[PDB]
Amino acid sequence: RVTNQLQYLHKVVMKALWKHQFAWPFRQPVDAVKLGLPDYHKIIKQPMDMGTIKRRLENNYYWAASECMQDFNTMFTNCYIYNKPTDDIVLMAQTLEKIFLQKVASMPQEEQEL
Amino acid sequence: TNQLQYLHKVVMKALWKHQFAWPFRQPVDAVKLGLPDYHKIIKQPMDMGTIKRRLENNYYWAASECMQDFNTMFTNCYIYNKPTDDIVLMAQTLEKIFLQKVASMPQ
Amino acid sequence: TNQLQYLHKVVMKALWKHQFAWPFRQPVDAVKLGLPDYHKIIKQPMDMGTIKRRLENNYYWAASECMQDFNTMFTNCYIYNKPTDDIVLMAQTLEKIFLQKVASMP
Ligand SMILES: Cc1cc2n3c(c[nH]c(=O)c13)CN(C(=O)c1cccc3ccccc13)c1ccc(CS(C)(=O)=O)cc1-2
Ligand SMILES: Cc1cc2n3c(c[nH]c(=O)c13)CN(C(=O)c1cccc3ccccc13)c1ccc(CS(C)(=O)=O)cc1-2
Numbered sequence: 556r557v558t559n560q561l562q563y564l565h566k567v568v569m570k571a572l573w574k575h576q577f578a579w580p581f582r583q584p585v586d587a588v589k590l591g592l593p594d595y596h597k598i599i600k601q602p603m604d605m606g607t608i609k610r611r612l613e614n615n616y617y618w619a620a621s622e623c624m625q626d627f628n629t630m631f632t633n634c635y636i637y638n639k640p641t642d643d644i645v646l647m648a649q650t651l652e653k654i655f656l657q658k659v660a661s662m663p664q665e666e667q668e669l
Numbered sequence: 670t671n672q673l674q675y676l677h678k679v680v681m682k683a684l685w686k687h688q689f690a691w692p693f694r695q696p697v698d699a700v701k702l703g704l705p706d707y708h709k710i711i712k713q714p715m716d717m718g719t720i721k722r723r724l725e726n727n728y729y730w731a732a733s734e735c736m737q738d739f740n741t742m743f744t745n746c747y748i749y750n751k752p753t754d755d756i757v758l759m760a761q762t763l764e765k766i767f768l769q770k771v772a773s774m775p776q
Numbered sequence: 777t778n779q780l781q782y783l784h785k786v787v788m789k790a791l792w793k794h795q796f797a798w799p800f801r802q803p804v805d806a807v808k809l810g811l812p813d814y815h816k817i818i819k820q821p822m823d824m825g826t827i828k829r830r831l832e833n834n835y836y837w838a839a840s841e842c843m844q845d846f847n848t849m850f851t852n853c854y855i856y857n858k859p860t861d862d863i864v865l866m867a868q869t870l871e872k873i874f875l876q877k878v879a880s881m882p
Contacts, residue, residue, distance in 0.1 A: 557809060557810055559862060559863075560772065562799070562809070563798065566798055566799075566801075566802070567798045598752050619772075620772055621768060621769050621772045624768045624771075624772060625765060625768060628764060628765070628768055631744075632743075632747055632761065632764075635744055635747035635748050636747050636752045636757065637752070640710050640748045640749070645748065649744065652740060652744075653737060653740070656733065656736045656737060656740055657733050657737075659736075659771060659772075660672070660731070660732050660733040660736055660771075660774070661776070661795050662772070663776070663862060664773060664774060664775045664776045665773070666772070666773075669809060669810065669811075
């Protein structure tokens with residue numbers, strides 16, 4: 556579907572996050588072989604990344620804005636769960652997530668299809 | 670504000686009474702709970718009791734500030750605990766409700 | 777250009793960052809937004825991204841051209857959308873700020 560809320564998430568939230576200087580670890584699925592993370596998929600059962608979210612927005616995959624919001628949330632939460640508290644990637648995720656939440660605070664309130 | 674009243678009377682009210690909310694209704698007492706590393710790892714403790722009181726005392730200026738406090742509380746949980754701990758699943762469940770209700774926050 | 781300077785550094789700066797600006801920051805994409813009739817109804821599309829680029833490149837010959845582009849943008853929204861769409865309220869809010877700022881232009 557195409558809704559006011561999903562348009563906002565695409566044109567405002569994803570636009571802001573995708574071009575952020577900390578976005579690059581998150582723009583594609585984690586490649587556990589490339590990154591040397593042999594237990595990644597034992598710990599993280601629902602991988603998510605902003606490339607996948609962006610494609611779903613582009614392809615009208617989502618039915619409700621909350622579904623997109625949950626994908627963003629899963630992506631951040633995966634990072635906090637998997638990594639050590641002191642890893643810089645945690646700081647990068649926190650930074651992006653704060654922007655996510657700041658932008659979501661102004662999202663259109665009542666979702667209706669376009 | 671309209672938004673802060675929604676976060677207080679709609680979002681928090683729903684999370685507060687949830688069956689998974691009880692670990693989050695007051696600050697983590699690391700001594701009582703036997704977590705001597707908790708405050709070495711978690712530098713910004715947050716909980717729903719603290720957020721609720723801040724909502725009651727007009728502490729916030731904007732809804733986003735309150736949303737960030739919710740966010741910190743959940744994130745602390747994912748950062749501090751082992752992936753396999755039940756408390757992680759409890760936080761996830763609550764955070765999904767938080768985001769669902771936030772989606773419908775008025776403008 | 778003092779007027780165009782004002783339109784760029786005061787009017788566009790306020791409107792561009794307003795929380796209601798996001799539907800107007802780029803051209804309407806009738807394909808991606810699924811609106812087969814948009815260009816049958818709206819003959820002169822306009823948006824704040826185009827206006828902003830024109831101010832930056834010294835495109836306009838007079839302030840009135842820039843103001844008319846703002847006006848066209850808002851009018852397209854009112855003509856195309858249903859009266860109850862939130863976007864109509866968003867355009868009304870932005871246009872009132874536009875006119876308020878225009879009254880104090882050199
Ligand atoms: C979600 C995610 C992304 C990455 N993740 C890693 C561990 N866990 C994760 O969740 C994770 C391992 N990883 C890092 O730790 C790392 C991060 C950021 C800056 C760095 C600077 C120096 C060294 C490492 C890093 C890197 C390295 C590079 C790429 C980009 S790409 C095109 O190659 O895939 C992605 C990740
Ligand atoms: C955010 C938070 C809250 C608690 N946390 C714990 C570890 N890390 C955390 O982040 C955390 C340690 N903790 C437990 O491990 C625990 C054991 C047995 C059953 C459980 C069921 C659900 C959740 C936790 C447990 C308990 C125990 C009790 C209370 C409530 S109270 C008034 O008595 O202090 C809070 C926590």
